[PDB]
Design a protein around this ligand. Structure first.
Ligand SMILES: *Cc1c(COP(=O)(O)O)cnc(C)c1O
Ligand SMILES: *Cc1c(COP(=O)(O)O)cnc(C)c1O
Lengths: 365, 365
């Protein structure tokens, strides 16, 4: 936690051998193709070094690096979009910079200046501005990472750290413009996070354990995992996305609900953007309240449920049409009802993100 | 073939630039000084490559390596002792190989042959045999590591992996030529692991979150953290060691009790060795059973508690003399009572580990 680094001290080293761009008409799979440059800033005793943009390359880590033994690592994830006016913009970057600072502090990694980092990221995207796709639904995924880098096997606060950022072009989540549903496996046996735990931070350690559970879901015929918490089986998250339910509550009011930030939930940026956007329309009750399987099951049998979806940077708004709970199939009417609300959220985010409409959430590069 | 590498096709690359070995009259900070060679075996969609012993060097990782983003990493820890007779021996290596295989499978990493790996580690050690100290209480710490290494940001099973092993000389714990207690901070606010969680595996992800809590202990005036679990505040672990309590239980019987393996406890090798050793003496009741703070307090007031200690490879047997619970000091009579039992366990392990006495637990290098 020492005096930050300055974007003003940014050293830039253009690449010698530019990677071959993907090229229109080619399959863009999520996070598999990377741009030409990367950001890199190191930390140690005298504090931060000067930030540098340099050619994309491999990292040289000491075998005893704490990032590889004790998981002193955290990451972030956000997107940049290119509008028809050829301008590139980042979606509410400030929220990500804040989340990252908090995660850093939870792991005892060096704090830094949120705006300086933001500026450095803007310069990086500027350098690889040509990598940003402009098709439909495409964008640039930005991946900042901060890791401890102490060459010691002692479990302690790092005296050396490393912060880098890489970029990669990602195609439309829904090829064709049409949204498609996903089935979810809901099994109480699996717990991704506990209160007093660290599930409300974007730390590597929270995902490794989920790989096995995801395979278990696929084998059962489901695409994603619905994480349940507590004896009351309350819904918390879906895969790596926040969960929303559009229904008529028990009291007869039409509402949109998502679980509260009780500690076992990651504060999604898209999640916050949906609440804000919905609060603004003032067309129905928008609330943060606990949701349990029983409440869901009752609503389903009474036909009060309209749409259920997941939210996250990867898949802005993701429709859910089926849940496998206790070896029992629960069909969710999401698609037969539109999905009206989902389609609306989608259209509005698209106009804001692609510059069709001027908005303060967008950060120009 | 494919599914497992073999010691038989091990490739050797002796270093050609030896490092200066520490001197007996020097410090020896736990995981800070490393030997000349390391073991390395890679894996991919096909299968394992040939294992190789090579000069100690840095790792070259692709910036998108899943080991750095999703914590697909696990490790092990064991010791080798230079017997008085000049012979080097490993302490119950088989239990570590098993624990490692289980951890690998929990993270969807490649399985391997436990005995083949053991043989490779023996060769590694043999090669660096002269690095093993022969002072008093000194030994060689062996650190195997297995990490996912696929260059993709998708949260999924790795198609690439990397297994390496490094060695480092370590001196006797606490004072070196003595036994000294540690104070513990017991605060329910901190949860190390939960049932259905992954705390019973040696995965990097379980330690990163503990750094902050350890600092919080130091500022409170304690050397270690006592992890409590559940509304009933049951004792589970101490820092990175298993916990044992030596007392006269409610029923008037003298016993040694340690928490049961219910999921939130890492199956310690030393822990298992203490239970075995104690059961063999048949001098008192040796049991695995839940222990709660309340039970501990009542026994402290009636003066039924004799010794409380932690166990682990780093510190075979570690005395506890104080616990800070709810901003209240609880003095533990461990030292005033000898610690008779702690010293007995110590003496016996020393004779077995240093070859003074022939035993099946020791593995000759
Ligand atoms: C990234 C993430 C989210 C969603 O956050 P966004 O900022 O909206 O991308 C939700 N849950 C988990 C576990 C996540 O990792
Ligand atoms: C390594 C470890 C232990 C003790 O295991 P040993 O095999 O006896 O070294 C106990 N708890 C945790 C959390 C550990 O990491």
């Amino acid at each position: 936690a020492s005096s930050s680094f300055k974007a003003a001290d940014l050293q830039l080293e253009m690449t010698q051998k530019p990677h071959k761009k993907p090229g229109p008409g080619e399959p863009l799979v999520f996070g598999k193709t990377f741009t030409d440059h990367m950001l890199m800033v190191e930390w140690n005793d005298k504090g931060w070094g000067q930030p540098r943009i340099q050619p994309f390359q491999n990292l040289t880590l000491h075998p005893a690096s704490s990032s590889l033994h004790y998981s002193l690592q955290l990451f972030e994830g956000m997107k940049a979009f290119k509008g028809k006016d050829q301008q590139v913009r980042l979606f509410r970057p400030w929220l990500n910079m804040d989340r990252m600072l908090r995660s850093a502090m939870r792991l005892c990694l060096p704090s830094f200046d949120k705006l300086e980092l933001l500026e450095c990221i803007r310069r990086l995207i500027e350098v690889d501005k040509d990598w940003v796709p402009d098709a439909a639904g495409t964008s640039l995924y930005v991946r900042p990472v901060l890791i401890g880098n102490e060459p010691s096997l002692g479990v302690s606060q790092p005296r050396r750290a490393l912060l880098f950022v890489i970029l990669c072009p990602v195609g439309a989540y829904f090829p064709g413009g049409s949204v498609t549903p996903v089935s979810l496996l809901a099994d109480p046996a699996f717990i991704r996070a506990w209160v007093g735990g660290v599930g409300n931070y974007k730390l590597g350690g929270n995902y490794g354990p989920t790989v096995l559970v995801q395979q278990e879901a696929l084998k059962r015929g489901c695409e994603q995992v619905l994480w349940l918490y507590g004896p009351d089986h309350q819904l918390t998250e879906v895969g790596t996305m926040n969960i929303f339910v559009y229904w008529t509550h028990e009291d007869g009011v039409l509402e949109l609900v998502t679980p509260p930030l009780n500690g076992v939930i990651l504060p999604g940026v898209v999640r916050q953007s949906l609440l804000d956007m919905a609060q603004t329309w003032g067309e129905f009750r928008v609330v943060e309240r606990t949701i349990t399987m029983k409440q869901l099951l009752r609503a389903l049998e009474e036909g009060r449920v309209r749409e259920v979806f997941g939210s996250g940077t990867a898949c802005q708004v993701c429709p859910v049409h089926r849940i496998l709970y206790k070896d029992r199939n629960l069909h969710i009417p999401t698609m037969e009802n539109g999905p009206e609300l989902i389609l609306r959220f989608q259209k509005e985010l698209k106009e804001i993100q692609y510059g069709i409409r001027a908005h303060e959430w967008m950060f120009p590069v």
